[PDB]
Design a protein that fits this description.
This is part of a larger assembly, with two copies of chain A.
Chain A: H1 10-13, E1 49-51, E2 68-70
Parallel strand pairs in A: 1-2
PDB class: viral protein
Keywords: bacteriophage, tail tip complex, viral protein
Entry title: In situ cryoEM structure of bacteriophage Ur-lambda tail tip complex
């Protein structure tokens, strides 16, 4: 127990994947679908309306015009009048 | 001097199959539920794709197939293909 060997060398095993991944943990490409085609899933933008259930509350950090997750959608009959007293119809 | 521990491995390779010892076997694609129950071909693309992500493809024979559209544009045509025959009414 006074002396301990078991040293090996970590200077070659960990370079085997690339030297730039050594200083930065590298990004994560998304999964390509046949329907997605050339378009790749962007984790910085999603310009569409998604169903509320089965989704997770998104967050924004800066600019990035974006769609939403629709919670309620319904069609009714509109009121024939703006307000006040202007109620001309004919 | 001596070179011990040969550790013959003929048995281990067969564990995954024997036909694979002579043929690498063709790869198979995955199934997308969204694309109904159709099976994707690995060597044909009937649909005409978009020229961007898809790499410039290669042809090797027959196969009426689609393409990768580079420019689509719709305008107003001319009345008359050519020559002096240019009647309208």
């Amino acid at each position: 127990g006074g002396m301990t060997g078991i040293l090996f060398s970590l200077g070659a095993s960990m370079v085997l994947g690339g030297v730039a991944q050594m200083l930065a943990p590298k990004a994560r490409t998304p999964r390509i679908q046949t329907t997605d085609n050339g378009k790749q899933n962007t984790y910085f933008s999603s310009l569409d309306n998604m169903v509320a259930q089965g989704n997770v509350l998104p967050v924004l950090y800066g600019e990035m015009r974006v769609g939403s997750r629709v919670v309620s959608q319904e069609i009714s009959t509109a009121d024939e009048g703006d307000g006040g007293q202007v109620v001309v119809i004919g």
